[PDB]
């Protein structure tokens, strides 16, 4: 089994992502903000972290930078409603950047790719 930490400030979106990823065969933990995400990730043993960007408190881009710095081989997907940050250099900390879509096929492909 692979374990994924799903980080997003919107509870109904956390819930949706948790359901979608459970269907693909993964075990899912969640965090509601960046600080919680870092606490969970550093103390835990995740295969992949999926990170929203816009959240109250530190942004997902800040979180991605910290994970990359303290876990060199971490697998990180930025999953955000907004394509704005794709050309943001902070986004370079992540392995993949996915804009949220109601069709989850693309996110699932990128997940399967990183968990190879
Ligand atoms: F609030 Be996330 F960047 F869609
Ligand atoms: Mg958000």
Q: What is the resolution of this structure in A?
A: 1.6
Q: Is 80 in the pocket of ligand 1 (CB under 6 A)?
A: yes
What is the domain extent for residue 76? 2-116
Q: Given ligand 1 and candidates 50, 54, 77, 99, which is best to mutate, with the most ligand atoms within 8 Å of its CB?
A: 54
Whether the Cβ atoms of residue 60 and residue 67 lie closer than 8 Å to each other: no
Q: Which residue has the tokens 């459970």?
A: 22
Name every residue whose Cβ is closer than 8 Å to that of residue 36 and which is 6 or more positions away in sequence.
Answer: 7
Q: Domain total for the chain?
A: 1
- The whole-angstrom separation of Cα 92 and Cα 46 is 20
**The CATH number of the domain where 52 resides is what?**
3.40.50.2300
Distance of CA 48 to the CA centre of its chain: 7
- The tokens describing 25, both together, are 């065969």
In angstroms, the Cα distances linking 116 to 54, 69, 95 are 28, 22, 13
Q: Give φ, ψ of 30 to 5 degrees.
A: -130, 160
Instruction: Report the structure determination method.
Output: X-ray
- The whole-angstrom separation of Cα 36 and Cα 22 is 21
In angstroms, the Cα distances linking 103 to 1, 33, 67, 79 are 24, 24, 28, 13
- The tokens describing 41, both together, are 């990730």
């Amino acid at each position: 089994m692979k374990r994924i930490l799903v980080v997003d400030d919107e509870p109904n979106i956390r819930e949706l992502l948790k359901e979608e990823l459970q269907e693909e065969g993964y075990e899912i933990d969640t965090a509601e903000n960046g600080e919680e995400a870092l606490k969970k990730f550093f103390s835990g043993n995740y295969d992949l972290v999926i990170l929203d960007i816009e959240m109250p408190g530190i942004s997902g881009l800040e979180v991605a930078g910290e994970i990359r710095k303290k876990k060199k081989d971490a697998k990180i997907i930025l999953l955000t409603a907004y394509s704005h940050y794709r050309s943001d250099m902070s986004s370079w900390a992540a392995d993949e950047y996915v804009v949220k879509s109601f069709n989850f096929d693309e996110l699932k492909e990128k997940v399967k790719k990183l968990l190879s």
